[model samples]
Structures are given as structure tokens and as C-alpha cells.
Target: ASIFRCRQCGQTISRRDWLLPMGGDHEHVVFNPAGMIFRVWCFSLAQGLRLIGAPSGEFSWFKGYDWTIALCGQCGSHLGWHYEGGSQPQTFFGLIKDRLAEGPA
Candidate 1:
């Protein structure tokens, strides 16, 4: 089923944030928690094209922290999230603002 849906407008959820492994070592960077999630994704228009040279390795920390995600193509609303693979598998999620019926945990 569609586990991630928009809470405000009854739409599907899209990733709204992502973070890269930065600072420390791969184990440390990968384990570093950012905001509500862990790790980051490599789907940026710039990052995807960064696999050319050593400079590619330098763009480890792009787009800042956990503010990368998917959005509704129709309304352009943030609905989900993405994270890089770390010591543990990271989760990519969508944010539902008011549809939970419960509350933020």
C-alpha cells in the first residue's frame, strides 16, 4: 500500500530531505544522524554529474543536511525523504503533516 501520503492534501508522499555522510570516517560519516533521519541520497542534478574525478569525492556534503526529498509533481509539495546507505540501511520517507490522526512522535 501507499505508506507515505501527504497529510495535508491527501496526496502521495515524496521525499523532502536527504543528508550525505560527512566528517569523520566512512563508518562515522555513515552513522552520523542528521535531523530526523540518517545518511543521504545521490540524486541531485549536480551530484549525479560529479562522478568524473577526485573532485567528485569532494562533494560529499551537498545540499546541506536533511532537507532533500521528493515532491508532488503536480503541486510541488514535499512528501518524502531519502538517505545514503550507512553502517545500517537508511530510510527514505515522506512527511504527512496532518493526516496521521495521531501526532508527531
Candidate 2:
């Protein structure tokens, strides 16, 4: 099993969770139209992702979705955002690449 945590305080956000099993060929990098770089990974699903703050408003893209800031439930660290409310009606959580430890220590 793999493990993940909050970088700031080492809070256990997820325990013994399975991650996206494949995507080896997919580029693991994302950009925010300019200088911002987003290093991302894929997961088929996850649970118990606690999100706080207001939604970033609805957008026509992504089949009409809203993005909101997601934080660590224990330490209040900025992990990523929880995306929902779209035409497809799907859920996923994105975490900062730097905020996670992928394996046993």
C-alpha cells in the first residue's frame, strides 16, 4: 500500500490508499497559462478529502465545474482543490506534488 501526507505538519490525510494504477506515458506536468507549474498525478478515486473555502465560481469549461481550495483537515495546510459540480458530475482531489510523500520511509 502507498501513503500520502500533509507536508507542513506530516498529518495523515490518507492511509493505505490505492492510487491511479497507470499513466506512465502521460506527461506529469501542468501549466497555468504562464509561469505557474503544476505537477500532477492521476487517481481512479479517493475518499475523505476535506475541503474548505468558497468555490472559485462556475466555469463553462470542464463541462461546467467549480474549483475550491482543499486543505488538510488536521493542520490546515493547503493541499490542493476539490473539483465538483459539473455536467458529468464527478469528484476528484488534486494535491500539490511537493506536499506528498509517495512511499514508506
Candidate 3:
């Protein structure tokens, strides 16, 4: 199974611990829950709602505020893209940590 770990605290996050939010403007539709990008988990926090379930509902939402953490599914090592959240569709926050195999080279 895929897992998420924090680079600073080494917190291991399971799918049960956090539900990956869907239907966001910035979230890649092709990668959401496809498991093709396991460890590549994405979530959006808007209007003071952190780690939301979905982009829907009556919650006050923001345009662009998403968190993506890429890790090694096998070891849960934070490999890339950790703690990314911002308020612009074009503006991205944070960089992939220890990125050796992911992203365009």
C-alpha cells in the first residue's frame, strides 16, 4: 500500500488517516487516485479548512491551495514535492524533495 511521510517530523500518513481531495482546479485529473502516481497525494485547504475531503460543499474555498507530497511508496521517504500550497493557479509552492526519478529531467 502507498504511504506518505513528512520529511521534518517523519510522520507516516495512511489513506485512512487522510482522504485525498478530488475535483480541484489545480489537481491533475489524470493522476487523482489513479495510483499511477501513488505517493503523489494531493489535497487543498481553503477558508481555514485544512486537509479537506473534496473541493465541493458549502465551505468557503480558495482558488489555489493544494498540498502535494511525493514519497517512496516502498519506504515512505519524502522524495519530492512536499508541503506545496498557494493561492494562484499559476503560482506553485514548495519543491519536490530529493527528486531523483520524478519530474522532467
Best by TM-score: 2
Would you list the C-alpha lDDT of every candidate in the order shown? 0.31, 0.56, 0.33
Clash count of each predicted structure? 16, 0, 3
lDDT by residue for model 2 over 1-105, one digit each (tens)?
Answer: 267766677666554354432334211455554566766553434444567776665431223557777777777777766667644336545556677665563
The local distance difference test score of model 1 is: 0.31
**For every model shown, what is its TM-score relative to the native structure?**
0.30, 0.64, 0.25
Task: Encode model 1's per-residue lDDT on 14-62: one tens digit a residue.
Answer: 2222322234222121221343433332321211111111212122332
Error of 1 at 48 (Å): 21
For model 3, residues 1-105, the per-residue Cα lDDT tens digits are: 333344444443332223334344233322234343423334321111123232221211224454444444445554433333443333232222222222111
Error at 55, model 1, angstroms:
15
